[PDB]
Every structure is written in structure tokens, then in C-alpha cells.
């Protein structure tokens, strides 16, 4: 029950690095499966 403390900003950063990690996983899987 606490409003996100504008660390909205840190969460956005983490989400973007996690997407980047997904992208790496995606082509590392797509490379060796080809």
C-alpha cells in the first residue's frame, strides 16, 4: 500500500535490460537451432 516512489524510473530501466536479455536469448536460441 505504498505509491511507487518515482522509482518508476528504476523499474523502467530494469524492464528495458530484461527485454535486451530476452533479445539475446532469442537469437542465441535461433542461431544454434540453425
Amino acid at each position: 500500500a505504498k505509491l511507487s516512489e518515482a522509482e518508476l524510473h528504476d523499474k523502467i530501466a530494469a524492464l528495458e535490460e530484461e527485454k535486451a536479455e530476452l533479445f539475446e536469448k532469442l537469437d542465441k536460441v535461433e542461431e544454434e537451432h540453425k
Partner: protein, 125 residues
């Protein structure tokens, strides 16, 4: 139909630093990786030479972001835009205090990531 040398991107660099033979058969694909300060935002980090003799690509990187540096005792940390690479935050002190140090800090390349250029100032008195 064939390509000359690829354009330089501000956000990424080629992966192999090979001879870079100034000419490339149509259909060639060159692999890239993000520059310091940038992170991947697309699955395809390539430049490809199309039938028109031109390099085709997306902006496949975005800015890295610095972590928020936390509170300033007896002062304020103000975000002006965001905490992304290249952005600046500002510091001030409350009425009964003098700011010693820098009034700003910037998200810059540090190590293999990104960090603040200046340490947090102190609010004193």
C-alpha cells in the same frame, strides 16, 4: 545493385572489425552490437545490402539508464528529463544549507555500463 561501405551508426558498431572490403555483394548482412551507453531494443542488429545497393537497418539500440542515486540529505535530487545516457540531474539544498560540490550530475559511460559523472554534493550548515 551492390553496396559500398556501410554508414557509421551513432548507437552501434560492427562485430568483426574485418578488412571492410569497400564493396559488398547485394544481400550481404553485417552484424552489429551496441556501443557503450546503449542497449539492445530489437532482435535484428544487422545492416543488409538490398537490391538497390543500399544499407537497410532499424535503430536496434536505445540508451542505457543510470540507477537513481538516492536522496540528498537536507536537499533535493531533481530529474530534468530522465536517467538515460546523456541526461542530467540537478541538486539543490534547503534554505538553511549551503551546497558544497556539484549542482549537477550526468549519466555517462562507466565500466561496462553507465553511472553518474559527479558524486552527490553535501548540504551543510
Amino acid at each position: 545493385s551492390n553496396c559500398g561501405p556501410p554508414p557509421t551508426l551513432s548507437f552501434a558498431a560492427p562485430m568483426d572489425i574485418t578488412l571492410t572490403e569497400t564493396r559488398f555483394k547485394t544481400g550481404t548482412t553485417l552484424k552489429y552490437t551496441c556501443l557503450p551507453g546503449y542497449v539492445r531494443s530489437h532482435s535484428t542488429q544487422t545492416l543488409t545490402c538490398n537490391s538497390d545497393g543500399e544499407w537497410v537497418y532499424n535503430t536496434f539500440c536505445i540508451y542505457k539508464r543510470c540507477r537513481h542515486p538516492g536522496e540528498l540529505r537536507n536537499g533535493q535530487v531533481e530529474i530534468k528529463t530522465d536517467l538515460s545516457f546523456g541526461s542530467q540531474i540537478e541538486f539543490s539544498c534547503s534554505e538553511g544549507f549551503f551546497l558544497i560540490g556539484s549542482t549537477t550530475s550526468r549519466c555517462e559511460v562507466q565500466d561496462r555500463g553507465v553511472g553518474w559523472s559527479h558524486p552527490l554534493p553535501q548540504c551543510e550548515i
